[PDB]
């Protein structure tokens, strides 16, 4: 219910910018994605996720 009624919009077009949005907040945004992709990006530079 919160995400549906969240302003500004929290929905993300593609996972390519979903990780980017997280990195551009310094921990003010959390992206919900598949665990396998979460572990893969976590192992990529610059280790900011």
């Amino acid at each position: 219910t919160y995400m549906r009624s969240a302003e500004p919009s929290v929905f993300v077009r593609t996972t390519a910018e979903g990780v980017a949005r997280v990195r551009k907040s310094k921990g003010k945004y959390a992206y919900l994605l598949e665990s396998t992709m979460n572990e893969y990006i976590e192992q990529r530079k610059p280790c900011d996720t």
Partner: protein
Amino acid sequence: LFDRGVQMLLTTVGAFAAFSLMTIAVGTDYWLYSRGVCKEEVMTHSGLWRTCCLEGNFKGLCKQIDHFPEDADYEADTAEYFLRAVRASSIFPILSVILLFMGGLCIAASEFYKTRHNIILSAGIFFVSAGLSNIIGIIVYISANAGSYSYGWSFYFGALSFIIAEMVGVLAVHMFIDRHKQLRATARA
């Protein structure tokens, strides 16, 4: 420390020297020597409002400090925004300048209507408040800075101005005590 004519001259010259030093400090863009961008990373000399490039491809062009930078500033808490508001406005250095000018005006006007003994007390209070304002401004500027580097001569121009302001403020109160001591001396006779 001795007599009254020499004390007058020492106090006014100290007040004027402090005023000039702080005017240079706030009006000159040499406060921080740090690596940065003047418009890649390059050694630049910073100030309070603008920072010109040093030993770069385009030397000598100053740009305004991004006090509230765009492109995901990430925001901050109320205290941090308060701190950036003070640092951008630089009110405390400017308030110190105003207090120094008011003290200088008071000491200059002390000659006119010499019977008013509270003008010198006002000048001393103004100078001491200017010193406190200098302390607050220096602390705020350094805290904003820490958000290799070295400080310029104008930063140490302001630092010396704070010391001079308190020393001049000390003399003004000593001047206030002596004249009130004279009133007690002439009352006994």
